[PDB]
Amino acid sequence: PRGSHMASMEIFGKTFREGRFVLKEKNFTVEFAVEKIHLGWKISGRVKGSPGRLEVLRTKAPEKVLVNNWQSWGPCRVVDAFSFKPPEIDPNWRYTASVVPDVLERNLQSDYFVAEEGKVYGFLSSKIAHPFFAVEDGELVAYLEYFDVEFDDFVPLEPLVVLEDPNTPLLLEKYAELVGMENNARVPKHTPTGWCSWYHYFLDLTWEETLKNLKLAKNFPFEVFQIDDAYEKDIGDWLVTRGDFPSVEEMAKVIAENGFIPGIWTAPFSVSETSDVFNEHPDWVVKENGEPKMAYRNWNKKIYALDLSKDEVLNWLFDLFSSLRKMGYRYFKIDFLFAGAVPGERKKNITPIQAFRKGIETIRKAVGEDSFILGCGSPLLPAVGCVDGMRIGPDTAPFWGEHIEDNGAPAARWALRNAITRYFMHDRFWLNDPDCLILREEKTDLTQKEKELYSYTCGVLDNMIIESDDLSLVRDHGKKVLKETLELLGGRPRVQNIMSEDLRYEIVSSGTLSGNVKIVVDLNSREYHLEKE
């Protein structure tokens, strides 16, 4: 039998049932199939014309839903769908909140997937359209947004799955396995360890301080030595240094001379209003009414988005990342990637998602198969198959964040929450990056118990482990936490109670380097209890 709830769903406006169907509307045509798969149903097919904001599924909204923001920093969390209040959106960061901000300013929005107890609805890809859900007058509606682009000939729909089982974590894991297959996900066999400058030195990093850490890093179990934001003269001018830094090429040569894999931060789809590249090439950016469209404001400057539909832009990206590879960099943290997918006017009439994918594909080609790509500030689904690792929460911080709301400002407590709630993408989409461990004992307000809680959770989850500290300031305790963390890697994790609303989670991982383990963590009390077999 079906189920009363399944007879009550609509697929492309028709009553739900298994079959093969054609919708011919005024401005578009859809051909689609509704087919049985393990644990549920798959809706797939093809579309042509001007589909616009295309309705795919409609069903009664659940009371409590696990919602997901489209990008690295945005929350994945359980919300009450009936008492939802639209947020005030910061005009300087509009597009990190939503790629369709008209939705978010009036209704609850979830990107790519949404879950309730016993049921996952999820799209398998975002190659052309942006897939998202909205709660509109008590109804859950799935959409594919094509951003007013027209298609003369058929292109594939992003597939939708509807999965049901009482084990919600199992469904999220299955969903993510299907996403990995649809997109030829990269799941490296080896996970890098390393050092990152950001969460000690921030923009005030000097090359003198960098060299001091490079010598000390020889006593710590680090493979990668990554320079973050600070070295560059302006956003977009990635090969021009400032302050006491040598050349970008010389930085690589010192780092490699000292026995590390050189790593470097860029924001490659972003160019500031002051940069040489923007002032040389005003034509290279996404536009609004013919003029440069602000993508976001950061570093106290307007930042514009590179128009990734333009071959001149893609050639510049190729040559940049080719040059970096020639210098010896083999670890690339590529940040603020949402900029490349902002809605706006481009040279070619392609979607922002199509443009985005051309840009990241160009970066991968340039750095080669032997380079590690870490995505950050990024749309998640469009990057599967391209990146090796991906930041999946908001920034951590050398403090827990007692007065920081769940709003995107840095805080260890909210960074950790996302590592938990997105755990199922790990070893399926890519390697999850939970953000850096901060293990120093001076110049921090983190307690030893908070450092433990953060680090051991990241280990049980088998996530990337990168440390970000002035290494002078890390002593016995910080060293022991890093050692014991690395002992918890290598397993298959599950968060058992993924729909929890009180920030206490039970987490198991099978087959770690320490055997079967279990950690119960409480992000309100700041406590954990870890058992290892």
Ligand SMILES: OC[C@@]12C[C@@H]1[C@H](O)[C@H](O)[C@@H](O)[C@H]2O
């Ligand atoms: O600017 C470097 C910086 C702060 C911005 C971003 O929030 C990223 O997620 C951080 O790890 C840093 O690389």
Ligand SMILES: [Mg+2]
């Ligand atoms: Mg693994």
